[PDB]
Amino acid sequence: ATCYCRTGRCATRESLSGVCEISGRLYALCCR
Amino acid sequence: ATCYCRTGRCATRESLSGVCEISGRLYALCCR
Ligand SMILES: [Cl-]
Ligand SMILES: [Cl-]
Ligand SMILES: [Cl-]
């Protein structure tokens, strides 16, 4: 899948799918 | 990025990047 680790909401064409943890920071997981 | 929601360990070229929550189930987020 194509996915992004986001600092804001997911884009409209993306689905919230979990959490990224990179270098200690949390991100929304947004896939399409 | 290219990401998969895994029930096992990440493949050699993937990095463990977080967790997926899909239909009430936990998975390892594996990204390359
Ligand atoms: Cl973002
Ligand atoms: Cl898997
Ligand atoms: Cl879920």
Side-chain angles (χ1 to χ4, degrees), chain A residues 7-30:
Chain A
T7 60
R9 321 296 192 82
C10 299
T12 311
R13 292 178 136 241
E14 298 165 351
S15 300
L16 183 58
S17 306
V19 165
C20 307
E21 180 170 30
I22 305 173
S23 297
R25 298 293 182 87
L26 260 64
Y27 301 83
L29 174 62
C30 304

Side-chain angles (χ1 to χ4, degrees), chain B residues 21-25:
Chain B
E21 296 188 345
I22 319 287
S23 294
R25 296 309 196 106

Side-chain angles (χ1 to χ4, degrees), chain B residues 8-20:
Chain B
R9 65 180 182 87
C10 296
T12 60
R13 328 178 201 109
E14 300 166 352
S15 300
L16 184 58
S17 303
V19 302
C20 312

